[PDB]
Amino acid sequence: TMKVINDPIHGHIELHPLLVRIIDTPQFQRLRYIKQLGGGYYVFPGASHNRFEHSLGVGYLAGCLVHALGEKQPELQISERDVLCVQIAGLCHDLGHGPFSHMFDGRFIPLARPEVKWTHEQGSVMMFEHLINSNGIKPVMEQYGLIPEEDICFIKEQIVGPLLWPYKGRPENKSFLYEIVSNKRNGIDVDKWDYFARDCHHLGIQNNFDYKRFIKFARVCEVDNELRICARDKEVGNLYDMFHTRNSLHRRAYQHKVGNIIDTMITDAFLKADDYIEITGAGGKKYRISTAIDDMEAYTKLTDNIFLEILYSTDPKLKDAREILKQIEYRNLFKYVGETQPTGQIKIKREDYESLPKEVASAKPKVLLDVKLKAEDFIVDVINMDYGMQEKNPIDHVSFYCKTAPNRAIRITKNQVSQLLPEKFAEQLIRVYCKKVDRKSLYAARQYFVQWCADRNF
Amino acid sequence: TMKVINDPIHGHIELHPLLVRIIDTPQFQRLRYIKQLGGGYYVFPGASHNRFEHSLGVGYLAGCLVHALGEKQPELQISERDVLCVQIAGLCHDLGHGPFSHMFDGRFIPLARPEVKWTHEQGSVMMFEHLINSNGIKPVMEQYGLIPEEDICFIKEQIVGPLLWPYKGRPENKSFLYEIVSNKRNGIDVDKWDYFARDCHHLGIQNNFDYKRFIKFARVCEVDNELRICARDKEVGNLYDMFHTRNSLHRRAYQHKVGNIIDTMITDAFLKADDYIEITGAGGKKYRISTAIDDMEAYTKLTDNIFLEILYSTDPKLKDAREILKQIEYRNLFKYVGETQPTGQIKIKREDYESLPKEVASAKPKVLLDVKLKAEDFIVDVINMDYGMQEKNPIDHVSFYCKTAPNRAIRITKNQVSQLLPEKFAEQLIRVYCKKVDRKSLYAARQYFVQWCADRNF
Amino acid sequence: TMKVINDPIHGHIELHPLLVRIIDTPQFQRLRYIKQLGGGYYVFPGASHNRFEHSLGVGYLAGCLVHALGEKQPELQISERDVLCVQIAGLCHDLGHGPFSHMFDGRFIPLARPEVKWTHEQGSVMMFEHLINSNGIKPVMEQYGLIPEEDICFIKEQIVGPLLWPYKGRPENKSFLYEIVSNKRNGIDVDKWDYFARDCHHLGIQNNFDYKRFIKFARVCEVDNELRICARDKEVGNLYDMFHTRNSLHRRAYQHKVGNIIDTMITDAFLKADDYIEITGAGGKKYRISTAIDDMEAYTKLTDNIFLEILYSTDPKLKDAREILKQIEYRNLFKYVGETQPTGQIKIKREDYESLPKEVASAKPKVLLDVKLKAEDFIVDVINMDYGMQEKNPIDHVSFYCKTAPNRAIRITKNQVSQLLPEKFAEQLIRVYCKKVDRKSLYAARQYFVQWCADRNF
Amino acid sequence: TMKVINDPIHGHIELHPLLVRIIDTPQFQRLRYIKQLGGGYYVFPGASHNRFEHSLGVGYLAGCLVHALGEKQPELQISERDVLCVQIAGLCHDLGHGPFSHMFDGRFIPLARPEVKWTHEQGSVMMFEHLINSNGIKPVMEQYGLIPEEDICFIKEQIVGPLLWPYKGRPENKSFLYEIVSNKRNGIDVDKWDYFARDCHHLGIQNNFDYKRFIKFARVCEVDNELRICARDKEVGNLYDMFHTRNSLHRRAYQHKVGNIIDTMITDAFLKADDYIEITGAGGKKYRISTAIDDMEAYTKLTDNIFLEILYSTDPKLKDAREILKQIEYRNLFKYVGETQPTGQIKIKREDYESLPKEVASAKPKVLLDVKLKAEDFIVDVINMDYGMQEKNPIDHVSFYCKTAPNRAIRITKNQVSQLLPEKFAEQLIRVYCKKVDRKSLYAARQYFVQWCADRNF
Numbered sequence A, B, C, D: 001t002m003k004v005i006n007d008p009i010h011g012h013i014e015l016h017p018l019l020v021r022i023i024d025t026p027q028f029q030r031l032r033y034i035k036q037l038g039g040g041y042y043v044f045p046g047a048s049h050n051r052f053e054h055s056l057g058v059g060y061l062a063g064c065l066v067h068a069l070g071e072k073q074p075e076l077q078i079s080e081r082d083v084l085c086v087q088i089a090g091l092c093h094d095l096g097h098g099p100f101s102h103m104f105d106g107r108f109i110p111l112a113r114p115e116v117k118w119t120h121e122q123g124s125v126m127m128f129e130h131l132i133n134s135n136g137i138k139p140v141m142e143q144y145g146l147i148p149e150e151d152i153c154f155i156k157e158q159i160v161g162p163l164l165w166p167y168k169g170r171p172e173n174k175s176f177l178y179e180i181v182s183n184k185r186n187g188i189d190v191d192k193w194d195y196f197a198r199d200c201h202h203l204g205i206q207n208n209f210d211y212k213r214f215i216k217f218a219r220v221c222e223v224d225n226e227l228r229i230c231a232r233d234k235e236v237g238n239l240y241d242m243f244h245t246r247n248s249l250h251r252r253a254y255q256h257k258v259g260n261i262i263d264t265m266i267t268d269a270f271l272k273a274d275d276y277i278e279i280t281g282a283g284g285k286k287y288r289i290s291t292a293i294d295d296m297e298a299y300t301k302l303t304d305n306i307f308l309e310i311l312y313s314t315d316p317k318l319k320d321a322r323e324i325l326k327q328i329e330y331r332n333l334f335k336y337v338g339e340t341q342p343t344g345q346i347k348i349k350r351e352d353y354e355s356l357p358k359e360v361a362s363a364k365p366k367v368l369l370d371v372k373l374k375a376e377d378f379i380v381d382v383i384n385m386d387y388g389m390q391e392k393n394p395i396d397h398v399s400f401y402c403k404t405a406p407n408r409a410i411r412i413t414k415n416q417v418s419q420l421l422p423e424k425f426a427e428q429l430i431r432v433y434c435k436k437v438d439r440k441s442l443y444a445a446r447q448y449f450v451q452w453c454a455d456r457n458f
Ligand SMILES: Nc1nc2c(ncn2[C@@H]2O[C@H](COP(=O)(O)OP(=O)(O)OP(=O)(O)O)[C@@H](O)[C@H]2O)c(=O)[nH]1
Pocket: A003, A004, A005, A006, A020, A023, A024, D042, D043, D044, D045, D258, D331
């Protein structure tokens, strides 16, 4: 029967029985042990939430948006099958996160296995197939009027994108159903609204966006030659404010210096613990931490528990990882030497990060200081802040309609809106750290840094 | 004794007995009948608050800031006399608003009496003198250790400014006390924090600024041979976000189209009712609505009650004002024809607003439309949005200090901060309204407007 | 077309065009100038709200409850005509309040005109007819599918009750529609939920009831022989907590001593100003403040403006009322002598309040004190606190259903629930004041009170 | 130097450097991995917080209360040494919690080791001693003006109580310092305020108590012959409301049926996993889960990680514990048969819970049903709800003072307050569960229960 669950952000959420069936599996319950912000919990003590309630909220908001669209415009022909499919896609959009969320697929996997390209959405697709095939959900889907052959492909396409009309789950007269959970065109979707609200509730920061007002004024118009979701022409300021809010959140919380350095130390400890911790998969077959993304049964057992397993270990071979984690526990962190002024002109590419410590080390300080450092004594971290679409104005890809003619989409240029808006939509900065605590090493490193920054006009 | 009052924004506020004595007078209790937002109550039904609680909050916040400064730096030598003076100045800073707050001294007085310059701060000073002299507060001030001949001048200077060191209330080693209640240099003071919080609580909009964090990191440094209040060097993003929040508040609430047109109609009704209403002042002498700012006893009786006095009147001579107010009550409003694109290059000055309707009327619509309008059928409203300091970057006038050297003040340039900040700090737009609203005077008026906006490159 | 309004309590509210038509009338806009809590604004400075937004909220909540009931049980056959009628009844349920809300019909009218029985619900019915007949809403109702002959009677019966099945607006198979806006059986309705939320938002007190959870578990069952709204059998603790919250609100805010004494003084001033202020009605016919409840046109002009009209008056004959109001403005209040212990055994009726002062005055204090007071120097106020149904357990009149059998209603006895619940549901206490401020009069009155409270076992 | 932490409940908290030193130890950082509500996270998905932030909040509130007391009464002679000692005692009051907080010392230890009497406060004392002696904090305490010989005893006495005047940390003229963190007389202390606010913030339930108002009106008086903390005589209703709030919280969240049954299953799994898991302590000696409370080094490594260590295990001997945990993960829980009506007359003692299943099983249902159950097929849970002092009115042990004479403490009886207060302060109920999911076993168990509940007048 129908079930109810109490959320501190959205209130009482109502769950269809098929969703209840999907939620009560080990593959979904694994998310109770993966934290939303990873290493930000060691700076903001209120951020102890996990991916489980975030996924519930995303599913609920997707259902709400589809219901509002269907009520407002009966000619779109939204059925309940589509509502269930969209809700399921919103529920399982993040099944593929690893320990400490973004740490795993942002810092560890690239360093541990540089020859593969892996993102947590591909893992989400893999884990969704594993869940469905392992927990016998196929007849249950058949029981409520779904056609699995089509609906599973539709859900997969909603989660990861196409696997002229490139999609296969739904025909070209249902294009607006692909913008609800994940919007790869302009980046407006219920996922952002959810984590905005939740991280602002937990971190203790105040929020700006009102997504209920946005849902009130949302409509489906025939843009170009395919149906899309359009906003009222007077919501442009609110859209710009939403993107400003996202930028402020990133700057204040998700790119904190100490949180990033703690993530760096955790990644280093996990790199040292690799080749010594073991995970068992399908058929009594053994796997590594880095190679566990090849077998889903072994991946099902990879959570934040590895941190405490390493910390409380006694094996002689995990000594160095234990040392790094104990260093974290005493608050003996790598220190901060200095940052670089933001600049959108000169760009450091993804293949060039492995040389920056060498550049910093191989400088010639003008003053005479004895203590000299090596290239292994520096960590360089580079932060990219934009509006989500690689220095393109995302509002340029949004359609609007006027009250007089609600069935006609139009475009709004930035100059028409205001003159106090930002002029560019991306930048980059560089941070330098030192792994020596001596009161003289922090002076030598700063002298080294003021000679490498004032060398290339950074 | 000591008294307590419960505030929905700040909680329980504690009041010194002298403040209690000052609050219990007719001149101060007059603020219970003046609304904070004037005509915004007819768009946002939650904004029914008055100036009384706003003044209480401003006084409380000024006390808190002074207390924190004194606690953190014992060498500044803040006495309790200074705390009481600052609290009193914060309490009585808005004694001078007339009916509907900003409408009175923004729209009515300039139109009713163009030969005088009057602001509500001068009225606040006049009313403060009237209150003190009329309610016998001089011995009471003497009773608690104040020296009225000095402290009254100090309070007046805090409220309105100077009446090289130009001030007289305090010597040059107490300069930081003149920017707590009103900051005429960079515009950072507890008044903004208070009305931010209160308007966001009542209107139903969400807030961003954390003034408690700002108070935590505030310090007094010697900036260029003069003591000032300095922020920590890492609060620059928060300051920029605060100014963005102020701009968003103005745009969303304080310059709403319908609220502005309602204010226009109220001002018109008040202009028509002038020369027919009587206010009695000192000595039994009579006064107008416009000339009541010359006698404080007559001004003490000028509140929002004039609206209902005109609406419920029966005298034959107030018929036109009654008609306009009844028009408001049925929601028969002047309609909106069109706005002008923002531009910070070409500026319309204060003396040029009386000719714009003539320009709009005297156009040559290319298309053939019969209905022709006159210069009395148009209302033109001009809106100036900036960062509070006439297109000067207010952050350029803020001092910062570093953690390593907290006694040295420095400057921070915009480029050092980020690249996504705004490039200019002011703009201007023009709104045109129609006063016929029938069926086709709007089509004709829209043609007139499109043929007038293309005649000057607007 | 459809309109939207932003509420700080419920968010964005959506209004049917007929409701918009009804709202834009003088009779409805009169509520913008009547305060919700009357004299509580002079103790709690945050309570400045009026009846306008409360009526909007009540209408919105009634619509929500009807919509949920219709969605959950398609067999009840709720039409959109019923939804509109219920929303209209919820919108206009308080059209009949006078100045300062409950003061007018609780203290003033009984004292001014003791020979009539008048409540603000009868006034609401009268004003609803005045509005409908005066603003030409009958064809507009006919335009949207309503049948005025039936629907107006239905709305009246919802507002005031019957004018075995005693009702006429709807047949006996629609009984559950008569307990949505006003519940005369157990006192559970959206009006309480609305004013709970609004007064807790404004006063700065915390709320506990969750009406959304209640709406989730609400159902319609056949209890005796007629349809009724039933709660889930596990919501009994929440119902008891709701009644505890209502009692706490009354005690903490609505029966504050200073607020009640301020209301007493306002009533006395209005009694003295009667026979000197005049109101014009239909046909150029003159009326008093007390006799204005006989002509709705004259009543339309009776708001809180009379307070400021008396305060700012100059006529010689209103001198005493002016004196009392000026006394309020300086905070020279009647003083508090003492209360009586609550007692639910000996009851004072409404006919003995006029004689209680004589009983208090005609006592003989044992000890010797020279200062002797009269019967005109005392005010006695009698406060009744119950659970809304005259010492009857309101939960005894609620039906519940079990999850296993949702179509059968049952009863739940108090002993089955808990042992920490209250044993009786009503009580009464008595307060005594003094209109003398002398430091000796407050001692003489206290002796008189201790010699009168020990004379009847109080 | 001074450090700041951002709390979602209290805002920005300042920490003295010695507190920062104490916080950065493994023994204190262990609390990041122990959940506040244990098994309530599987019913309320928002309750994912740990003991770390709760301890921070308790320390902050204790500091605030001491500061206010010292500020409004300079004659008490509170020094900064006392403030630091009280803050430290408030910080470390819960160092001794085991996995899943109250489950460990409420259900597991009594069943695992009935021969010992162990509470988490004794563990807190032991762990505080271990922390101080192991992390070299003694010279650091000496550095800031503390005398360890006296101050450590004072802190220990604050945490656990005495180890006429029975105390040793402070003399009899500082008695009011022993009821700030833990109040063993009437149960009013900052710990309750903290967990009230935090659990209401996370669970999604609303709160009633205002501790800031309580702090405003708090004072120190000499009640019998020792200094105590007294409330203003008009805060009695607020105190009663606070205890009602605590009761409501317990009923609604802390004694949820499904949460309690999940705790039962976790305890059973941990009992089966005992004698198979090992923990290493001081000297390389090995310990069990139940015997780890004898060595603090081994206890430092006992957190919620054991749950996931058992769940992800592969050893053959942990099969049954793995089965129970996997059962939890699929939501195949023990079922609820029925409860018993509350009755505070015949109490079931602590030693009598081991035979209740036998009593339930050894009944003779009147009607005929074939399926027969055993005494091992039933779990009986007994719940005690009171006001924290074993059916004694806690308000009877509170002192109050009047405004006229603030230095005299008085008593207030319940009859003087109101008649709607509860008459008894304790009760007891019994819940029965079945471990046989079926369609006939759940009927047989109910038939057995309605014959055992009617055999003793329950
Ligand atoms: N099924 C399920 N419920 C959850 C979960 N997390 C929180 N809950 C809530 O916890 C409550 C406990 O109910 P159930 O787990 O279904 O136990 P029950 O209600 O006794 O079992 P039923 O006979 O199915 O009603 C539910 O109403 C949910 O709202 C979860 O992960 N799975």
